[PDB]
Amino acid sequence: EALQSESHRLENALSIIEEERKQLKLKEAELQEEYQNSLRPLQQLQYLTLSACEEEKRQELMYEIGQIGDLIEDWATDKREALKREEGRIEDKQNELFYKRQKLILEVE
Amino acid sequence: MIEERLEALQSESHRLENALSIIEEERKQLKLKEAELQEEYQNSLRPLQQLQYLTLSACEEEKRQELMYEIGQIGDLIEDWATDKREALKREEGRIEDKQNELFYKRQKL
């Protein structure tokens, strides 16, 4: 009486994987929106500096702005990498369970 | 039964002495990341402060308030990034203190 558990347990751990996959695709969108929002005041400062500030001093300003660009760039890519790690862990768990199902068929034999 | 008596005393020495070396090096780890944070926090604000200074001299008075607002919006972001990092380090500190207390109150033989 293996399929009773193994087939029913596997169909549920599988669907659990498919929900975490969706949940991850959503955290991807959230990072991008967060990445956008985090850059809005920086971009604001780019535009506003054009109108208000000495042109011969504005390049020193843009350099600072770029410096802040990098910090944000490092923060978002770091996050992006975390979510890529998660994307592997889920995929790993999926294949595992795939390989569990193919051998369970053999057990039901 | 003094041979099992001796064997237990040795694994307890090994156990105690090992957990104590772990914690000492984690504490040293934690303190390093702590100063790493207070360094990262200041370096993350250096360009922000640079702009504050530079905008005073180079930008029209009537518009610099708008700039300073945007600067503040960015400071808030760094603020959240650091404090959250700060709270991660505070979590590690309790973890170690936990492991320490687990080792002290089972003994308590002074």
Author numbering:
A (entry chain B): 7 to 115
B (entry chain A): 1 to 110
The publication says:
Bacterial type VIIb secretion systems (T7SSb) are multisubunit integral membrane protein complexes found in Firmicutes that play a role in both bacterial competition and virulence by secreting toxic effector proteins. The majority of characterized T7SSb effectors adopt a polymorphic domain architecture consisting of a conserved N-terminal Leu-X-Gly (LXG) domain and a variable C-terminal toxin domain. Using coimmunoprecipitation-mass spectrometry analyses, in vitro copurification experiments, and T7SSb secretion assays, we found that representative members of these protein families form heteromeric complexes with their cognate LXG domain and in doing so, function as targeting factors that promote effector export. Additionally, an X-ray crystal structure of a representative DUF3958 protein, combined with predictive modeling of DUF3130 using AlphaFold2, revealed structural similarity between these protein families and the ubiquitous WXG100 family of T7SS effectors.
Despite this discouraging trend, LapD2 was the sole exception and after systematic optimization of its crystallization conditions it formed crystals that diffracted to 2.2 Å. The crystallographic phase problem was overcome using selenomethionine-incorporated protein and the single wavelength anomalous dispersion (SAD) technique. The overall structure of LapD2 shows that it adopts a helix-turn-helix fold that is reminiscent of the WXG100 family of small secreted T7SS effectors. However, in contrast to characterized WXG100 proteins, which typically form head-to-toe homodimers mediated by hydrophobic interactions, the turn region of LapD2 contains an intermolecular disulfide bond formed by cysteine 59 that facilitates head-to-head dimerization. The head region of LapD2 also possesses a hydrophobic patch that may contribute to dimerization. Not surprisingly, the energy of head-to-head dimer formation as predicted by the PDBePISA webtool is highly favorable (ΔiG = −21.0) due to the combined effects of burying a hydrophobic patch from the aqueous milieu and possessing a disulfide linkage. PDBePISA also revealed a toe-to-toe homodimer interface, and this interaction was also suggested to be favorable, although with a lower energy of formation (ΔiG = −11.6). Notably, conservation is very low within the interhelical turn region, which contrasts with the highly conserved WXG motif found within structurally similar WXG100 proteins. One of the more striking features of LapD2 is the disulfide bond formed by Cys59 that contributes to dimerization. This residue is not conserved among Lap2 proteins indicating that an intermolecular disulfide bond is likely not a universal property of this protein family. Consistent with not playing an important role in LapD2 function, we found that an S. intermedius GC1825 ΔlapD2 strain expressing plasmid-borne LapD2C59S secretes wild-type levels of TelD.
